[PDB]
Every structure is written in C-alpha cells, then in structure tokens.
Design an enzyme around this catalytic site. Sequence first.
Site, mmCIF file in Angstrom:
data_model
loop_
_atom_site.group_PDB
_atom_site.id
_atom_site.type_symbol
_atom_site.label_atom_id
_atom_site.label_comp_id
_atom_site.label_asym_id
_atom_site.label_seq_id
_atom_site.Cartn_x
_atom_site.Cartn_y
_atom_site.Cartn_z
ATOM 1 N N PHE A 1 14.113 -4.346 1.622
ATOM 2 C CA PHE A 1 15.104 -5.235 2.022
ATOM 3 C C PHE A 1 14.722 -5.937 3.496
ATOM 4 O O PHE A 1 15.012 -7.185 3.615
ATOM 5 C CB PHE A 1 16.247 -4.232 2.545
ATOM 6 C CG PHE A 1 17.291 -4.284 3.634
ATOM 7 C CD1 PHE A 1 18.136 -5.471 3.477
ATOM 8 C CD2 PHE A 1 17.322 -3.653 4.887
ATOM 9 C CE1 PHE A 1 18.925 -5.672 4.665
ATOM 10 C CE2 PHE A 1 17.980 -4.004 5.800
ATOM 11 C CZ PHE A 1 19.133 -4.830 5.948
ATOM 12 N N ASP B 1 13.715 -11.131 6.066
ATOM 13 C CA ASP B 1 12.562 -11.727 7.215
ATOM 14 C C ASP B 1 11.945 -13.086 6.590
ATOM 15 O O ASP B 1 11.612 -13.941 7.390
ATOM 16 C CB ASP B 1 11.528 -10.677 7.734
ATOM 17 C CG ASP B 1 12.194 -9.587 8.546
ATOM 18 O OD1 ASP B 1 13.285 -9.541 8.972
ATOM 19 O OD2 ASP B 1 11.410 -8.563 8.990
ATOM 20 N N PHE C 1 -0.239 0.455 16.552
ATOM 21 C CA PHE C 1 -0.482 -0.114 15.382
ATOM 22 C C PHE C 1 -0.116 -1.588 15.480
ATOM 23 O O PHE C 1 -0.778 -2.293 14.790
ATOM 24 C CB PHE C 1 0.475 0.526 14.376
ATOM 25 C CG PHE C 1 0.467 0.085 12.858
ATOM 26 C CD1 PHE C 1 -0.720 0.398 12.242
ATOM 27 C CD2 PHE C 1 1.312 -0.859 12.751
ATOM 28 C CE1 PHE C 1 -0.672 -0.038 11.066
ATOM 29 C CE2 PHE C 1 1.298 -1.330 11.064
ATOM 30 C CZ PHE C 1 0.133 -0.925 10.187
ATOM 31 N N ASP D 1 13.585 -10.268 18.841
ATOM 32 C CA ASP D 1 12.460 -11.154 18.321
ATOM 33 C C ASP D 1 12.886 -12.569 18.289
ATOM 34 O O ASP D 1 12.488 -13.213 19.108
ATOM 35 C CB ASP D 1 11.837 -10.741 17.053
ATOM 36 C CG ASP D 1 10.315 -11.071 16.972
ATOM 37 O OD1 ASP D 1 9.925 -11.583 18.017
ATOM 38 O OD2 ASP D 1 9.777 -11.312 15.807
ATOM 39 N N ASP E 1 -2.444 -4.885 15.085
ATOM 40 C CA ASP E 1 -2.070 -5.906 14.165
ATOM 41 C C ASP E 1 -2.134 -7.394 14.854
ATOM 42 O O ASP E 1 -2.717 -8.392 14.225
ATOM 43 C CB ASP E 1 -0.599 -5.838 13.728
ATOM 44 C CG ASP E 1 -0.615 -5.576 12.106
ATOM 45 O OD1 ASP E 1 -0.852 -4.417 11.674
ATOM 46 O OD2 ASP E 1 -0.228 -6.859 11.685
ATOM 47 N N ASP E 2 -1.684 -7.659 15.987
ATOM 48 C CA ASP E 2 -1.715 -8.793 17.036
ATOM 49 C C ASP E 2 -3.045 -9.131 17.155
ATOM 50 O O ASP E 2 -3.621 -10.452 17.086
ATOM 51 C CB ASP E 2 -0.814 -8.857 17.952
ATOM 52 C CG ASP E 2 0.515 -8.473 17.826
ATOM 53 O OD1 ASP E 2 1.088 -8.413 16.714
ATOM 54 O OD2 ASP E 2 1.485 -8.062 18.832
ATOM 55 N N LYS F 1 0.783 -1.297 -0.159
ATOM 56 C CA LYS F 1 -0.001 0.046 0.017
ATOM 57 C C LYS F 1 0.918 1.181 -0.074
ATOM 58 O O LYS F 1 0.330 2.208 -0.264
ATOM 59 C CB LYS F 1 -0.877 -0.131 1.082
ATOM 60 C CG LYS F 1 -1.742 -1.207 1.407
ATOM 61 N N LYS G 1 11.904 -3.146 16.357
ATOM 62 C CA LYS G 1 11.912 -3.854 15.013
ATOM 63 C C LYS G 1 10.659 -3.227 13.901
ATOM 64 O O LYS G 1 10.958 -3.558 12.801
ATOM 65 C CB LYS G 1 10.982 -5.298 15.392
ATOM 66 C CG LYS G 1 11.046 -5.975 14.049
ATOM 67 C CD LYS G 1 10.483 -7.583 14.358
ATOM 68 C CE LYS G 1 10.192 -8.362 13.072
ATOM 69 N NZ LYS G 1 9.924 -9.784 13.512
ATOM 70 N N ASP H 1 12.137 -16.474 8.562
ATOM 71 C CA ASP H 1 10.920 -17.156 8.942
ATOM 72 C C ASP H 1 10.473 -18.484 8.128
ATOM 73 O O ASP H 1 9.510 -19.013 8.508
ATOM 74 C CB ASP H 1 9.361 -16.324 8.594
ATOM 75 C CG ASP H 1 9.597 -15.261 9.273
ATOM 76 O OD1 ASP H 1 10.256 -14.945 10.209
ATOM 77 O OD2 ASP H 1 8.493 -14.290 9.265
ATOM 78 N N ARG I 1 3.954 -13.667 0.514
ATOM 79 C CA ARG I 1 3.872 -12.368 0.999
ATOM 80 C C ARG I 1 3.108 -11.321 0.069
ATOM 81 O O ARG I 1 3.288 -11.326 -1.295
ATOM 82 C CB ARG I 1 5.296 -11.891 1.013
ATOM 83 C CG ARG I 1 5.620 -10.530 0.882
ATOM 84 C CD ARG I 1 6.031 -9.506 2.317
ATOM 85 N NE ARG I 1 6.893 -10.246 3.203
ATOM 86 C CZ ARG I 1 6.421 -9.842 4.579
ATOM 87 N NH1 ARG I 1 5.499 -8.937 4.771
ATOM 88 N NH2 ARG I 1 7.048 -10.410 5.584
HETATM 89 C C1 LIG Z 1 3.345 5.492 8.427
HETATM 90 C C2 LIG Z 1 2.293 4.449 8.341
HETATM 91 C C3 LIG Z 1 0.891 4.697 7.983
HETATM 92 C C4 LIG Z 1 -0.189 4.010 7.798
HETATM 93 C C5 LIG Z 1 -0.004 2.463 8.016
HETATM 94 C C6 LIG Z 1 -1.126 1.710 7.721
HETATM 95 C C7 LIG Z 1 -1.209 0.394 7.532
HETATM 96 C C8 LIG Z 1 -2.469 -0.055 7.406
HETATM 97 C C9 LIG Z 1 -3.024 -1.560 7.035
HETATM 98 N N1 LIG Z 1 -2.263 -2.428 7.064
HETATM 99 C C10 LIG Z 1 -2.314 -3.205 6.013
HETATM 100 P P1 LIG Z 1 -0.447 -3.769 5.765
HETATM 101 O O1 LIG Z 1 -0.288 -5.119 6.743
HETATM 102 O O2 LIG Z 1 0.349 -2.843 6.390
HETATM 103 O O3 LIG Z 1 -0.559 -4.019 4.297
HETATM 104 N N2 LIG Z 1 -4.336 -1.527 7.075
HETATM 105 C C11 LIG Z 1 -5.185 -0.671 7.202
HETATM 106 N N3 LIG Z 1 -4.746 0.730 7.462
HETATM 107 C C12 LIG Z 1 -3.505 0.683 7.364
HETATM 108 S S1 LIG Z 1 -2.659 1.920 7.705
HETATM 109 C C13 LIG Z 1 1.327 2.133 8.397
HETATM 110 C C14 LIG Z 1 2.338 2.977 8.547
#
Ligand SMILES: Cc1ccc(-c2cc3c(NCP(=O)(O)O)ncnc3s2)cc1
Lengths: 342, 342
Positions: free
Chosen positions: B91, B96, B232, B167, B236-237, B50, B193, B100, B105
């Site tokens: 990189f 990673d 963040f 980690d 994610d977890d 993204k 990390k 792993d 990916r």
């Molecule tokens: C500096 C910065 C700004 C935004 C992100 C975001 C990741 C992400 C996200 N993650 C999907 P990803 O596992 O990062 O492809 N999903 C929904 N919204 C967001 S926002 C991560 C880092």
Amino acid sequence: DVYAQEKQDFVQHFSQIVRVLTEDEMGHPEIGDAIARLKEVLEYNAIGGKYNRGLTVVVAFRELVEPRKQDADSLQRAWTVGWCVELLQAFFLVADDIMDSSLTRRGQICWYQKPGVGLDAINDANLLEACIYRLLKLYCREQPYYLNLIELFLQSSYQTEIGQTLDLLTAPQGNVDLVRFTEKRYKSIVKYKTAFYSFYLPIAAAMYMAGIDGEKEHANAKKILLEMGEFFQIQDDYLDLFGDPSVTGKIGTDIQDNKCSWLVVQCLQRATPEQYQILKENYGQKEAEKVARVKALYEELDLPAVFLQYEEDSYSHIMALIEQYAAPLPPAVFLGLARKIY
Amino acid sequence: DVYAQEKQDFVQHFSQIVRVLTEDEMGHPEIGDAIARLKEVLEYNAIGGKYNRGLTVVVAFRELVEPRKQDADSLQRAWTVGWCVELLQAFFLVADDIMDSSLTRRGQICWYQKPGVGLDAINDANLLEACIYRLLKLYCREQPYYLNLIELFLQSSYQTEIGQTLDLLTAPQGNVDLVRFTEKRYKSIVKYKTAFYSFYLPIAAAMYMAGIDGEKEHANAKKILLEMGEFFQIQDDYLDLFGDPSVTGKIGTDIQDNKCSWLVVQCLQRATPEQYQILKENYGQKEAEKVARVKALYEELDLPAVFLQYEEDSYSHIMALIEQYAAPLPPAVFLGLARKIY
Ligand SMILES: Cc1ccc(-c2cc3c(NCP(=O)(O)O)ncnc3s2)cc1
Ligand SMILES: Cc1ccc(-c2cc3c(NCP(=O)(O)O)ncnc3s2)cc1
C-alpha cells in the site's frame, strides 16, 4: 427538519474534532508542520457539504437510545462518530476527484488542483481516513461498541473501494463499451460504492452505540437501507440530466463522462439496433450537440415518465420494507430518511 | 539466515492469502471482476521484494512463544500477520511511487505506469490496505490479541502517513531549500515514515501474538527498534551514493531528487559559506556533472569516514540499548535484526 435542529451543534463540534486531532500531539514539537498540514486538509475537505450522513448518526442515536442514557458525553461520542462518517466520505472524494481528474467539488477547486498540492493529496486523503480511527480511540476506546465501530468503518471502506474498482472497470475513460452497462452491474456498483457507506453505515453506527448489535437486527436494517441507497443514486442520475439546475446548482456531465448511469441502462434495454448506434456514437463525448442528441434520445424514449414510474414503485417498496424489517427499531428511524430522499 | 530457513514457507503461504481474499466472496457473483482486479494488484505489488518485515514477524513469534503453543494454526496466523505487514508496505509503495512520479520499483515498471492503470492505482493501493483488516478478521478474530493488532496496524499507517507529509513538506519537487534540512527534521522523518512500520511494527505484532501486551514492554522494545530503524535508513542514504551498485542493483538518485538525505544534512552542518553555494547550486538537478560535483563535495568532506565513524558508534549504542531494554524478551530477537542490518 429534525436535521436543521441538530445541524448547528454538529458543525460547531468540528472545532473540537480538529483541536483534538492537532492538540493530542502537543508533546511532539518535531511533527508540528505535518499536523498544521493536516488541519488545512481537514478544514478544506471535511467542511462545505450538507453533512447528511454524519447528522444521520446523531438523529438515529437520539431515536434509538433511552433518553436517560443521553448524557453529555454520550452525545459528544455521537457527534464525534457522525464526524467520522464525514471524514470517511472526505477521504473518498479527495481520492475520487484525483482519479476522475475533476476540476471542482461543490463549485470549489478540488484539493488536489490547489497550487502546491497535486498528488500529495493522495497522502492527505489517507490522513483523513486515519483520523477516523484516531477519533474512535480518543472518544470510544472504553465503550463496549468500540471494536464494532472499528470493524464497521473498515468494512465501509472496503465495500466502497470494491465498488470503486467495479466502477472503474465498467466505465474506463477513453472506452465506449455499452456491453458492460447492464442492470445487474449498475445495481452492484451502486450498492458497494455508495449505498453501504451513505445509508447503512450511519444507522449501523448509531445502532451499535445504542447497544443494538445483533446480526439479525443489522441484516434487517441493511435490507431497508441498501434499498434506499439504490433509489437515492438512481434519482441522482435522473437529476444530473433533468433536474432543473437552479434546484441543484450542479450541471450533469454524466453522459460526456461515459458514466454507467441509470439512464443509459434503461435506454439500452429499451432500444432497437438503430437506437444503439446513435448512442454508441454520441455517448461519452464532449460537444454540446452530441450531448443534446442523447438527451433527445432519452426524452424521446419517455425515460422521465419511466423514472416517475420507478419513483412511485420504489416508494411503496421501501414502505413495505420498513413495515416488514424495521421492528424493533422505531420505524421513524427509516421514515426520516425516506422523507429526505423522496 | 534464520530468515532463509523460514522464507520458502512464507512465500508459499501467499497462495493461500490470495485464495482466501478472493474465495471468501464466492457467494457474490456480482463483484467477480473487482475481485480479479484485486488479485492482479496483490500479485504484482506484494510479490518481488525480500520480505524482511513480514518474515521478522514469523522469526520473532518463534522466539517469543513457548514451543508447545506453536500449533499449526498459530503458525498460520504468524504467516498471515507477516503478510499483513507486507501488504501495509505494498500500500505505501504503490502510493509513494505515484506521488514521486517514479518509473520503476525493483527494476520493474511501477504499477501505476502500467497501461490501463494510471491513477486507478490510488484505489488499488487503498485495497491493499483494506486486505490487511480482512485477513486479521479471517484469521485472528477470536484471538485475545485481535484488537491489539488492529490498533497497531492503524497506528502504523498513521505514523507513516504523518512522516510522509513531513517528508513532502521538507523536500518539495521544484524547490531547493536547504534551510529545511536539519538534523532534527531528518530524524523525525525517518522515525515516523519508515522506522515505526519497518522495525517496531513487526516485532510488536509478534509480541502481541505471544501475549506480550504490556505498555512498558512495548515502550522498551520500541526504543531499541526505532534506533535500529534510524541507522538502517542512514545506511540506506550512504549506500545510495557510495554503495557499490552491483552490491545493490539500484543507483542513487537521492541528490537529483532534492532528498533530505543523511549526507546533505551532515554536509550542511560541515560547511563554510562557499561550500553552501556549490551545494545550493548543484543539489536537486538532473545532469551528471552537477551530480558528480556534489559527490565530489561529499568525498572531499570525508563523509564516508564520517559514516564509518557513525556506523561504529551506532552499533555499540544499539548493543547497550539491547543490554538495557531487551529483557524479558530474549536478546536474540533484537540481535538477529542487528545482524541483518550491520
Ligand atoms: C525488519 C527488517 C529487517 C531487515 C531489513 C533489511 C533490508 C535489507 C536490504 N535492503 C534491500 P531492500 O532495499 O530493503 O530491498 N539489503 C540488505 N539487507 C537488508 S536487511 C529491513 C527491515
Ligand atoms: C444518509 C443520507 C441522508 C440524506 C442524504 C441526502 C442528500 C441530498 C441531496 N444531495 C445534495 P448532495 O449532492 O448530497 O450535496 N440533495 C437534496 N436532499 C438530500 S438528502 C444522503 C444521505
């Protein structure tokens, strides 16, 4: 040796290199376990070689700087930058040994084959590389040559990594293809993969530390030193197979490994089509007799004589290059190196 | 999104990033095959995500610089530095995924699992890292912030690599040991990390490009942004296991992999000794029902409620941090990011 004289002091400075790369973070109890791992990685992989590249930084700095500017702290920075060159090398080897599936390095188990390490050695390797820039910042941050050295080491990495790709493309494992093994490709791989970091890098680094920073001076030194690096590697390939192995310790697996050696290159340009076949059928294989029969095709082609002929021509070529391109550096900077390698 | 507005122009600049990293060496016919490989490596691994981190450089630069100093060339440098942050990430991931033993990916085959790549991906990865400094030199060499950005990216690598060691030490493969899985260690791993490079790095980079280079301003921004990075990753977890997987695409293997997740940490500090056992026996294993029975122990412990509670507290903590530490940067620099992540 002008090397054995400064050697002791080089290896002893390593204790301080390490203290500083583990002590500077005493404010962060949180990461102590990573910093211990880092120490183990430094100790296992930056120690045990001859230190020729790192020591060259120190010797060259001494020959380049006016002796009234060799204060205690100037020397400490030279020792530190010499160790930076050794860590750059330790990063490359730890990673190469993983890519090659090597077993040992200096007759010791490669770091990635140690129990519990495996492919984590990829991060360890990258950490060795990161130590370089940590030390530069710790020791050289105020110096006018700071940025110059940062760029030189990054360029040294890049050249090497490019030469590694070239090597990898040229000699896959599981692929005899002698069509790739040309003279131009061999020189290319050597220049990018080993000569820039092994020979240009350490003299260049001392040159910047000495205030010698002109593009022309560096271009001139580079011409001489890439030429020496070429010879050093060609001699490495010759010895691999013909070096008396008690005079090396190693025992050459170049042929088994499908390596783009100087030997197979000369062999190929010196071979009727029946010769091609015997090589095409015996190169890059494991069993003794199929490797004896390549060593036999080389001996049969007087490649040892060819080498000795190349070594003679090369030595006068280098000396003419020194005559022509050394000034205004003292020729001894280049002559000391020529003496170690011939 | 202020992101979807600049996105197109970000992805389109990639063609130029690549031309330049392959064209600048048109004087060297010799290494063309390595440079082709490099191109393939850039195209496969720097494209497909993204671009949130790289885009943050661009958005932040626009909010930080007076608009009379956003000339065409200034923007080009912002786009380029945004791509540098994406290459730093490429990189890390390429390396990673090798460490792993990952398979895919972004639902695509990891680069190291492609036929003919294997562990050569270690050099490819290192080449991605080297491109960063090539581009900085090509685009930013004359700028007063040049050295600042070099040091920032090297520090970003080092922090990440340190966090990777942490980690790796904390969660070996083939080792259930929940004694390592503490709150302090979790925060530590996250901060080193992922938060430094994901959140501090891209805002810091725009700050230097904007002439905002004071240590205090950077320390202040860092406090806010490491806090956001922590959240963040915790989110994610949580999502890994409870995210509706059509809203992600991914499907969480955290538990199977013995990951130091935020969940297992909370779980552990919230558990009588009988609970420990069920976890000690089901964590880090492959079969559905033993992974269903951990998801059951989490649901049973209202960890989803705990998360929602943490997400609320966290959001007001971040907003207070913005209030307190954003000035003299426009608060919107931090508010745009807070909006993407909450
Ligand atoms: C500096 C910065 C700004 C935004 C992100 C975001 C990741 C992400 C996200 N993650 C999907 P990803 O596992 O990062 O492809 N999903 C929904 N919204 C967001 S926002 C991560 C880092
Ligand atoms: C800059 C520089 C200076 C000297 C060398 C030498 C390596 C070497 C050598 N190589 C053994 P090695 O495989 O480098 O451990 N053997 C005998 N003499 C020398 S001199 C390599 C690089």
